[PDB]
Amino acid sequence: NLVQFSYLIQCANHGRRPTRHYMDYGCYCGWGGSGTPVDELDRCCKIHDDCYSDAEKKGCSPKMSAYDYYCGENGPYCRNIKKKCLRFVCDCDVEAAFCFAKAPYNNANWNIDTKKRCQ
């Protein structure tokens, strides 16, 4: 689920940025599919939204999947092997968490008018 995603985000970035900062960024962060990914960070969010879609096609509800992870000192990692839907959804969230951290944050691309900018 999303509480765990927020935890995987803070682990991969190490406190430097709030999860709130990522939920209304560009055209795709916040899950509204629209236009072109404006940024590197915005492509992380499109890929993540798309990841969660394959998940739902395999029977995995991203919302209802409470998986198992461990936050190490280099960032998060998934511990599921057998419970296959929990590991798939964990991978969507872990790879997005690391993407968000390694990606540059344009403060100018946070909260853009998506009606205009994301067509």
Swiss-Prot record:
Protein family per UniProt: Belongs to the phospholipase A2 family. Group I subfamily. D49 sub-subfamily.
InterPro entries: PLipase_A2, PLipase_A2_Asp_AS, PLipase_A2_dom, PLipase_A2_dom_sf, PLipase_A2_His_AS
Tissue expression profile of the protein: Expressed by the venom gland.
Molecular-function GO terms, alphabetical: calcium ion binding; calcium-dependent phospholipase A2 activity; phospholipid binding; toxin activity
Highest taxon of the lineage: Eukaryota
Localization per record: Secreted
SMART domains membership: PA2c
Its biological purpose: Snake venom phospholipase A2 (PLA2) that inhibits neuromuscular transmission by blocking acetylcholine release from the nerve termini. Notechis II-5 is less toxic than notexin but has a higher specific phospholipase activity. PLA2 catalyzes the calcium-dependent hydrolysis of the 2-acyl groups in 3-sn-phosphoglycerides.
Keyword Transmembrane: no
One GO-annotated biological process of the protein: lipid catabolic process
Residues in the signal sequence: none
Keyword Hydrolase: yes
Catalytic reaction list: a 1,2-diacyl-sn-glycero-3-phosphocholine + H2O = a 1-acyl-sn-glycero-3-phosphocholine + a fatty acid + H(+)
A GO cellular-component term linked to this record: extracellular region
Swiss-Prot/TrEMBL cofactor(s): Ca(2+)
Gene source species: Notechis scutatus scutatus
Protein name: Basic phospholipase A2 notechis II-5
A Pfam family that the UniProt record links to this protein: Phospholip_A2_1
